[PDB]
Amino acid sequence: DNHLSIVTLEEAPFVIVEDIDPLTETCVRNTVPCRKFVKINNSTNEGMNVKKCCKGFCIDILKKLSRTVKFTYDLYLVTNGKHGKKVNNVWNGMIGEVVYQRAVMAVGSLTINEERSEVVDFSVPFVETGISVMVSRGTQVTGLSDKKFQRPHDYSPPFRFGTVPNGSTERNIRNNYPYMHQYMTRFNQRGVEDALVSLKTGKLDAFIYDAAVLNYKAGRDEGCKLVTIGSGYIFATTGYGIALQKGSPWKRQIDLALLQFVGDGEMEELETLWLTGICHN
């Protein structure tokens, strides 16, 4: 069968969620239907699958794959976690939906890393990403090995830096730099927007996060005051990839199609449409 359950997660500009137009109850323009399970109340787990509309860079990738590889799909937004973390030996988020076979594939701002590749297969990367550091222009940081990150109490006052927990960036820091990581958790940010405000008003000195999202946010920052350190510095360079079930029959054709989109300039079109900003460096 060629009708596929597919999971996604909102993260602008890769996946953006809109309400459906109330007069037509249809998703129009550049959007596709996507459902979200929403609870009635906090006492029971009864809920409704709410019809919404999705758009963005990764949604356009999905539309192109659906056409070229010839499948249709039922797109839903994950509500158990976010991108993916193993908690008590059980994967949640988009990764978990694929591992436990609720989704044939996961499409979104999903970082390829080694531990996820042990439990899902990833397509070729279709966005370059990794870990970057965002600061207010003027703040000096060499990279992740900067002593202010690695041995933070060697400085008075210590440097104030954090991430959004439970994603690939926190997992990388936890695995590589134990002292840094345990220091940082007091600066955990609830989301990217909170972190940007905290930086801009000087309550936080640096925000460590997915390179693609930070480069996008730097590109649209009001006044071009928040920047990623270095000459587009990226640590642990990787990509967003489509996650598929181990052994998936869809992987080969998805890989070839993504690589065909690159060769034919289609990827450059999506960059122009979704990823360009007015700030540069």
Partner 1 sequence: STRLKIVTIHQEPFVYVKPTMSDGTCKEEFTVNGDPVKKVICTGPNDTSPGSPRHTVPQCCYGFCIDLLIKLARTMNFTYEVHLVADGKFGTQERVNNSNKKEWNGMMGELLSGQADMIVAPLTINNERAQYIEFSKPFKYQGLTILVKKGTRITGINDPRLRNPSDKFIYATVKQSSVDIYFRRQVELSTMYRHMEKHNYESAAEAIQAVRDNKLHAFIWDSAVLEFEASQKCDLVTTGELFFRSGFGIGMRKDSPWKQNVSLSILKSHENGFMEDLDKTWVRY
Ligand X SMILES: N[C@@H](CCC(=O)O)C(=O)O
Ligand Y SMILES: CC[C@@H](Nc1nnc(SCC(=O)NCC2CCCCC2)s1)c1ccccc1
Question: Which positions make up the binding site?
Answer: 109, 111, 116, 168-169, 210
Binding pattern for the stretch 220-239 against partner 1, x by CB under 8 A and - elsewhere: ---------------xxxxx
259 interacts with partner 1 by CB under 8 A: yes
The residue at minimum Cβ distance from ligand X is 167
Start-to-end Cα distance in the chain: 48
Contacts of 195 (CB under 8 A, 6+ apart): 134, 162, 164, 189, 204, 207, 209
Nearest in space to 241 (alpha carbons), one of 80, 65, 67, 86: 65
The listed partner (ligand Y, ligand X, partner 1, none) that binds 210, CB under 5 to 8 Å by sort, is: ligand X
Distance (Å, whole) CA 38 – CA 48: 5
CB under 5 to 8 A by kind: which of ligand X, ligand Y, partner 1, none does 111 bind?
Answer: ligand X
Under the binding rule (CB under 8 A), the answer on residue 245 touching partner 1 is: no
Task: Give the C-alpha distances (Å, rounded to integers) separating 165 from 7, 185, 202.
Answer: 21, 8, 21
Q: Does the N-terminal peptide bond of residue 157 adopt cis geometry, omega within 30 degrees of 0?
A: yes
Residue with Cβ nearer partner 1 (10 or 170): 170
After which residues does a break in the chain occur, C–N more than 2.5 Å? none
Nearest to 107 by CA among 8, 39, 229, 19: 8
> Which 8-state DSSP code applies to residue 11?
B
Residue type, 44: T
Where is the binding site for L-glutamate, in residues?
A: 109, 111, 116, 168-169, 210
Quick one: which of 26, 117, 182, 185 contacts partner 1 (CB under 8 A)?
Answer: 117
DSSP 201-245: TTS-SEEEEEHHHHHHHHHH-TTS-EEESTTT--EEEEEE--EEE
Task: Give the residue, chosen from 128, 139, 151, 266, that forms a contact with ligand Y under the rule CB under 6 A.
Answer: 128
Which of 167, 189, 228, 254 binds ligand X (CB under 6 A)? It is 167
- Least distance (Å) between residue 238 CB and partner 1: 6
Residue 216 touches which of ligand X, partner 1, ligand Y, none (Cβ within 5-8 Å per kind): ligand Y
* Residues binding ligand X: number (CB under 6 A): 9
91 SS3 class: strand
Among 124, 165, 166, 174, binds partner 1 (CB under 8 A): 124
DSSP state letters, 94-136: HHHHHHTTS-SEE-SS-B--HHHHTTEEEPPPSEEEEEEEEEE
- Establish if 31 lies at the interface with ligand X (CB under 6 A): no
Query: Among 33, 125, 143, 230, which residue sits at the site for ligand Y (rule: CB under 6 A)?
Result: 125
Tell me which residues touch partner 1 (CB under 8 A). 112-114, 117-118, 122, 124-125, 128, 130, 143-145, 172, 175-176, 235-239, 255-256, 259-260, 262-263, 265, 267-268, 280
Tell me which residues touch ligand Y (CB under 6 A). 125-129, 211-212, 215-216, 219, 239, 262, 267, 271, 275
Tell me which residues touch ligand X (CB under 6 A). 83, 109-111, 167-169, 209-210
